[PDB]
């Protein structure tokens, strides 16, 4: 099960550390799993009953967070899964929140634009009475956007009687959102890839970067990569294939070509290559910003990069890590690596607890920041341990979750 | 499944009366299920997590109501289906209240009172979000009493800030609880058991009655039917054995053995014989109140008995129901029958909400008053349709829950 | 000090029963005491503060019961005493309520109506804190009355968002009162006078009463036992003096005599006597409704009372009790003769619960019905220990109120 | 009485000043003193009562601010009177609380560390009713920690039913602290060090410093003094005796060895001496943070010091108090010397509130700026009366919190 | 009617730019509008009951944000005018609050002091239904202050049952009132009138300014302009005349004069003029901080300043608009220029929120920050449309109100 294994990876980093048997049993069970059959009322007049999740499994450091997921292929095991991730994810970069998730199983290509919204009204109704803002804090995911998140944050405050935008992140801008929320993950990826720099001390200015993938984290990622580090972002790719050069791609064309056209992909001034491929270049740092397992057995073995950035989830396999620790190639953790998300979003739930909102600069700044600390907190466990960078990611996090249930009673 | 066999029986009757399909799959799925993983800590000091059940099917009618359970084996399977029960359960009765059952998979005999009483106090403080004396009304069950049911009551008050006495029924009558509690089932079957004559135009006098078990459920109807209808009790047996006697059995001599004795078998002047000879008897009225499928197949054919009170949970199968129809012996649905039960918790909670308590006349006679009525309306019913009583009284709970449902959008 | 001596009281039956150590603390302390200092502006223009007290003893059966007093010598200890019977005579009763008790070291008579209805609101703002109609139900007591009580009502209203009218008991009829509120002490006294007449063998056509005082509970009583009971009334006494007349007074003519003149002495067709020699008369029943000791010592041996009903508050004491005992004298414990008072303000918070009101008829049937209960449970006890009917139904009293605290946990 | 002579030194300023009478008189007592009485089931098994208090003196600036103390010798008496405190000591550093304290009667060192937690949740459940974050807000005190700390807030939040955090301050770090807590009072004697010598025109880099006593508050004040402030700590003393030396001590040194030893003394390179001589010590700063009444008669006749900043509470008796002024010798009032602490639990609840925290070197400025207006402010009353700074102090108290009150009716 | 002549000029807006015919409806009407007639007691002891409104027109971007007024003549018309424009105001401004107002049908100068107060408890605790922290933030208008906001703010607090602080602006500073309230709209002005000298790239020092009035903007305006801008103001005017000086004024001089006299007139070193006059002055820049209407179709062709910054509420009609914008003379809109007083507020109700004050320069640079951007993003808005500058500013508010309410559902 989905669930089980990412037990399993808890497990290890357990007996790693003198961890309590009787606590590691209660971090590992999620404390709050409600499900629910609700109605939405189509507009052909016919009713029709649709499932939802929400999953708070520790809520020990704080609030309950963790986004939604609209997909026909929803299971429990899989809500329950992420939101045990969300707990580490979040202790690991040090924010007073818990983990949360949540999902509906239905296909937001097949309901219309009325239907969505009701049916995201009649959900975020029904999951009410275990949100709040300082009991779950939910976000958006996979099929969900600003545009819904808004629609969940209007529906509370419609529900409790007052105004409230702080018991969903990820809202517009101009409605409580927070600057920088885009460019968040990519920019989280940015200071890592400089800091992998640093410990294997590449100079970032003739440092070569390779992309796999280029959707929101790998656009941002390679732009701020190349402007902010001067690094240069040799190749990237798309799910169709990818370009290369050892000259450097012009990351702001890039962009606008993949939003001129579908893909990278023709771009000239490009040598045409496999995604696979790309990710055996010969670069210093490997940004797997794709899809998972990217990086496995077969590859493991030829990969050329000296540190992998994981922009993506999962896309190296254990296998893989295996592997690349023992050829010591430094894998930084997805669960540090593209928390910059997440960051943000801590960010606009404070501003919007104030009502006070920050400028770009100021995000930018704390997103940074605090990004730079995880990464040093996650080095220093790492060296006590003698472990994978991820594995030690994972101690940290188990660690600081287990001192506050401990103080807690 | 369990729970997808309690549809299936659901199914038959919504294919009897003309539902509307996208309504029906409303009244099929479950509106909450609340599963809790919480910590107790044991006399021992260490911590031991234990797996927690809520279900409100439906709230349609009036806040959810149903019982807990205390089992090593439950599984949220089992409490479904029992919760998806309740809702036709009370609605045949005509009371207020929804659909709703919870569980703890645990053994009360490997703990300790006091680890018992922890564990019942945080279940009841983790499922608190979604029970209320206006949404949810959990009561006693398998391997849960008054004394545990008192500490539920105790807990939410002390959490609320106040006194609420109406949190939870079956409490202990110098704390809100209800007289006529106990003898509540049997005077139920006892109702039953004389309407089960008078349709017949079988005179009480003279009737005779045998019933398979001895439980709260079996002495209780045997001693009021003998006493209140003047019906003799040729015959009762227990997990052992049972006796005969066409003279009829003294029902309070017969009880005080059974409580000086394990057994009612060796009890003198009663003709010994095994519980399906007891079932074969020839008696106008076979009470059933053991266990299930106790009238089969090969029994079916064979039972002389003119009327079926079924005092236990299913003890007729389906296979018996069809035969016994087709004999035209009349067998009275438990989800009526037994319902006595759920029908004094009504009147507790009603008390509750008051403040005010009434004597044992006013509730014996409100129980039968009312049982009165739910008899005569799935016979109606009954007759519109031409059908097993079961059925009848199947249809009557499901339509009367759709008009609600209807009615509120 | 007064509260210690309650305490005392409460020890010597606590060791007649097996009561638990652990457990006797509990019940001896009180739960909670707030104590208040609250300005209130004058009509001169300065301001005045006053210190105000609220104990609630226990609440274990239910909501504190209690009056408050406005009074220029209250200390927190007549305070805490005060609550801490409460807390058995509401036990006695069997009424779902539990200990409390209130007042303002103030002096009414110094206040302009005005300044009075100001303090009281004030008052009730500060001590609002820890009541409810589900928490403390306050109610009149020395020098407040149903106006008092009123604004009391209405302030709380006005705090909480919505009419109450059941955050106190003894409201103006129109208003959330209850009829019969008058009789009531009195009606209590008559239903005890007469059973006292019964365990005696009495016939109550024959038999004669005294009664030392005519207060509301004087009055009432003696009018009710003449009229309802029979029993010719040869005696009452003012706070002046006593007449006497073996033909018995016409109570109804008696009354009005002492509405039109001060006192009942003078009056025609009425042998004159003290107030001491009342007490001294030859009388089948004797119902002190005056003053506290009363009967003592120097008394004691020389009443002629087969029976004393205690109208009034303490007026026999613990000496006479001995004696008395020892005599073979039947002496009914105020807490449970006095206590119909307490009991039709029960009805009251229930008539306002579900804010339908019942007719005196109904009052009467309930506050005589219970009465009756009361009496025979004490004397049930009474055999059981073979002790002082005051003493049973002091064990009574613990006993009920230790079983709910034993069941909470 | 402890209450009365706190009352005492307040008239004394009021007096000072034109202070309503009428209004003087709320401004002394309390608002509310609330007294409960809890039972607690020790290890054994059997049961045992606590007394518990929580006073609220004044709430008009802002909630009630205080902390609670475990103390087998704690009177009401104590507890008022140092809410009477509070509620000067916050109103001097300008901070939008009240004036609360609380405490209960228990000897810490005689209870299990489950029995002491037990206990800690069942008072803090039973003044819950009084308290909130908007309300009163409970802090340690003597013997109580953030470990106690921790279970009060964790306890609300399951009460309240949603993490709080901001209910009580002294959290442990990783659970809602504030960085700079443990310094905080020491760095408020260093800021007042400081201005007390820029007053009296003596360059810090070349005064001379003792401190009396080697706490929290006197390590640290020695400390920061040290290094910030570049004056030399020529002594210092444990609950032995003292060390001097015109050389100056390593503070830092001083400390270790204070922590690898019980006390100070011993330590080489320090001539030893009593406590009394460390007074008397020709020193330009006398840091007094040890005992009550250090500086009494006797002493003050003798002191050399030029200004005494009072790390402790109350080191300084009236008489001494007189004869220093007299003498011409600057004493810095307690309630604004050591009130660090107090500020810095303000800037923990201010984070609480938005749930963001701030560093340590924001904590730092923070409390150095508000400390030094504080202490400026202080100076302008006292030459605007031309008194003792500590009556400067408490009038510009009273005058705030009157303004507050006559401004709000 | 007042109102519909509001509505008249957003149609205007409404027309030139693309809004949904439906939706342009919905932002037309207003949501809330609550009519009371509460009863106060008198000082000669009769009751008077007093008739009270207050309306939130939108509440889309925020919590509805506005005024109270006290005035014999009040009508439901003139309070929904007013929130109507709140509406527009705050959105001009970006601030999180929507549209609301309120008033009272009384005259302050007939009523006492006490009476007075009274009357605003009552009315705040007859609106409070609707109003809130985060529903509707009322704040001072015409006839009521910051002691009457103070009434307001205890009584809401004391009728929540805590300190909120933040239900009401304008409040005294030691109050929770922000510093820089006062100079809050000239500072505004100020800002604006600084920028207007910039799009005509007339420099500050040499310039020249007028301003009719001296009130609270008056003062405060010019004072600034003159210290912060270098700008001279050659004239300003009272109720009474105006003066005039090439030279430039002492504004300084100029307040302590109208402070000691009751006009500016007289005041030696200045041409007494008319306040006509005044308008038709040959300055650089007009700041209208008086009356409406000043500036009229026959003044209109008469203006020779090159700018006119609108200190007042419409002191130019429609017609003077016309002209003006064909004569090429900018308008700064009243709805932007003396916003500062409403963005000030907004600041005081966040530093409430997190209970942390912000000293002077923080709201001074705040103030002007926001100030810059409004004025700016009317520009952007007035370039897009070629229209005249007030109505950019009308637009962008519909603007973005109707994004939030479109992005709302």
Same mark, same amino acid.
């Given at each position: 099960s989905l669930y089980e294994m990412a037990v399993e990876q808890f497990n290890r980093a357990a007996s790693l550390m003198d961890l309590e048997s009787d606590l590691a049993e209660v971090l590992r069970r999620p404390k709050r799993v409600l499900i629910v059959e609700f109605p939405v009322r189509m507009d052909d007049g016919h009713v029709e009953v649709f499932t939802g999740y929400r999953v708070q499994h520790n809520v020990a450091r704080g609030p309950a967070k963790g986004g939604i997921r609209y997909h026909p292929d929803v299971t429990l095991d899989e809500v329950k899964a992420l939101a045990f991730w969300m707990t580490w994810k979040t202790a690991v970069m040090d924010l007073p929140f818990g983990g949360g998730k949540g999902g509906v199983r239905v296909d937001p290509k097949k309901l219309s634009?009325?239907?969505?919204?009701?049916?995201?009204?009649?959900?975020?109704?029904?999951?009410?009475?275990?949100?709040? &803002?300082?009991?779950?804090? +939910?976000?958006? *995911?996979?099929?969900?956007?600003?545009?819904?998140?808004?629609?969940?944050? *209007?529906?509370?405050?419609? #529900?409790? @009687?007052?105004?409230?935008?702080?018991?969903?992140?990820?809202?517009?801008?101009?409605?409580?959102?927070?600057?920088?929320?885009?460019?968040?993950?990519?920019?989280?990826?940015?200071?890592?890839?400089?800091?992998?720099? *640093?410990? $294997? /001390?590449? %100079? &970032?200015?003739?440092? !070569?970067?390779?992309?796999? /993938?280029?959707? #929101?984290?790998?656009?941002?990622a390679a732009l701020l990569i190349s402007q902010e580090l001067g690094s240069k972002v040799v190749?990237?790719?798309?799910?169709? @294939?990818?370009?290369?050069? &050892?000259?450097?791609? %012009?990351?702001?064309? $890039?962009?606008?070509?993949?939003?001129?056209?579908?893909?990278?992909? !023709?771009? +000239?001034?490009?040598?045409?290559? !496999? #995604?696979?491929?790309?990710?055996?270049? *010969?670069? %210093?740092?490997?940004? &797997?910003?794709? $899809?998972?397992?990217?990086?496995?057995?077969?590859?493991?073995?030829?990969?050329?990069?000296?540190?992998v950035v994981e922009g993506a989830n999962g896309p190296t396999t254990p296998e893989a890590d295996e592997i690349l620790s023992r050829r010591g190639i430094?894998?930084?953790? %997805?669960? $540090?690596?593209?928390?910059? @998300?997440?960051?943000?979003?801590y960010f606009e739930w404070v501003q919007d607890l104030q009502s006070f909102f920050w400028d770009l600069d100021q995000v930018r700044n704390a997103l940074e920041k605090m990004m730079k600390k995880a990464f040093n907190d996650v080095m220093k466990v790492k060296e006590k341990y003698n472990v994978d960078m991820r594995t030690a990611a994972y101690i940290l996090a188990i660690d600081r979750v287990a001192y506050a249930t401990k103080k807690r009673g």
């Open positions: 634009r009325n239907e969505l919204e009701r049916l995201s009204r009649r959900f975020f109704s029904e999951i009410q009475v275990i949100i709040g &803002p300082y009991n779950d804090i +939910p976000a958006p *995911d996979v099929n969900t956007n600003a545009d819904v998140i808004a629609w969940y944050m *209007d529906t509370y405050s419609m #529900n409790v @009687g007052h105004t409230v935008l702080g018991i969903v992140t990820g809202k517009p801008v101009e409605l409580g959102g927070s600057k920088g929320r885009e460019e968040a993950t990519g920019r989280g990826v940015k200071v890592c890839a400089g800091l992998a720099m *640093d410990v $294997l /001390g590449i %100079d &970032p200015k003739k440092a !070569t970067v390779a992309v796999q /993938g280029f959707g #929101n984290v790998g656009q941002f190749a990237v790719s798309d799910s169709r @294939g990818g370009i290369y050069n &050892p000259e450097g791609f %012009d990351v702001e064309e $890039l962009i606008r070509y993949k939003k001129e056209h579908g893909t990278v992909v !023709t771009y +000239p001034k490009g040598e045409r290559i !496999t #995604n696979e491929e790309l990710l055996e270049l *010969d670069v %210093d740092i490997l940004v &797997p910003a794709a $899809l998972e397992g990217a990086i496995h057995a077969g590859n493991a073995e030829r990969i050329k990069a000296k540190a430094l894998v930084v953790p %997805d669960i $540090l690596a593209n928390a910059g @998300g997440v960051t943000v979003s």
